[PDB]
Design a protein around this ligand. Structure first.
Ligand SMILES: C[C@@H](N[C@@H](Cc1c[nH]cn1)C(=O)O)C(=O)O
Length: 254
């Protein structure tokens, strides 16, 4: 390896998005360039729509994916992942005036790896509150998978990008959403989004898997080993923690 092409969505702030000039920027872009410097590889970032991000990697259109991608079990069936470069729980989003905000949270930190009758009870409480409530999620995400598998009785609308979800929630076309704390905290910290609030349990595991990793082809064992070495070094020296505070406003490093 001498040069690699890394794909990113280009519409998932603060992980990957476009600045004023249209240049790809964000946590994934900064970390991508840092990791490649540690690996002694030339780094080229390309914009790719979420719909064909995994098949374009397997087809050989580029060598890696750094696009806020959760290491989820369904994805592991198709591609390989590096070591997680960020750890984030999942939570719900609504409006600041929404009665949903008054709901009691019995389990603050909800792991989904092995749902006990008590965790199922907390999940069912929310499902029942969420009936009649219009839900919005980005298509092809772990958010959609959670909603279809864990809360099937809840009506969901799928969107092209997360920016369309945010638009519709602010507009009043949808009542609530789901995404990670890493996306939602920078969003709710913005003064333009004082009308948006995070709520409910903070969920980990199950179909959300463990952390955000680099998407690599399964046969590219050597490229995975290189990224794993680079990621461990970037975490140990505090580079991931620095970029996490710089882009998310808190430490989400493993
Ligand atoms: C970290 C990020 N992961 C999601 C959503 C996502 C990543 N890129 C575009 N959408 C996923 O892997 O399906 C999130 O939950 O907020």
């Amino acid at each position: 390896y001498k040069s690699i092409t890394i794909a990113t969505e280009g519409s998932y702030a603060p992980y990957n998005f476009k600045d004023a000039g249209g240049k790809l920027i964000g946590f994934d872009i900064d970390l991508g360039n840092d990791l490649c410097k540690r690996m002694n590889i030339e780094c080229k970032f390309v914009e790719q729509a979420w719909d064909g991000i995994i098949p374009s990697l397997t087809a050989g259109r580029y060598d890696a994916i750094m696009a806020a991608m959760g290491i989820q079990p369904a994805r592991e069936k198709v591609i390989a992942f590096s070591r997680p470069y960020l750890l984030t729980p999942m939570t719900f989003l609504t409006t600041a005036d929404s009665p949903l905000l008054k709901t009691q949270v019995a389990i603050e930190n909800l792991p989904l790896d092995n749902i006990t009758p008590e965790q199922k009870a907390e999940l069912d409480k929310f499902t029942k509150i969420f009936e009649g409530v219009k839900f919005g999620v980005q298509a092809g995400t772990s958010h959609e998978a959670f909603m279809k598998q864990m809360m099937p009785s809840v009506q969901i609308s799928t969107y092209d990008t997360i920016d369309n979800v945010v638009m519709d929630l602010k507009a009043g076309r949808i009542d609530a959403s789901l995404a990670s704390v890493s996306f939602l905290k920078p969003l709710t910290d913005k003064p333009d989004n004082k009308d948006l609030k995070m709520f409910g349990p903070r969920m980990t595991g199950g179909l959300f898997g463990k952390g955000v990793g680099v998407g690599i082809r399964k046969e590219d064992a050597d490229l995975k080993a290189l990224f794993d070495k680079a990621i461990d070094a970037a975490i140990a020296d505090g580079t991931v923690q620095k970029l996490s505070q710089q882009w998310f406003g808190y430490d989400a490093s493993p």
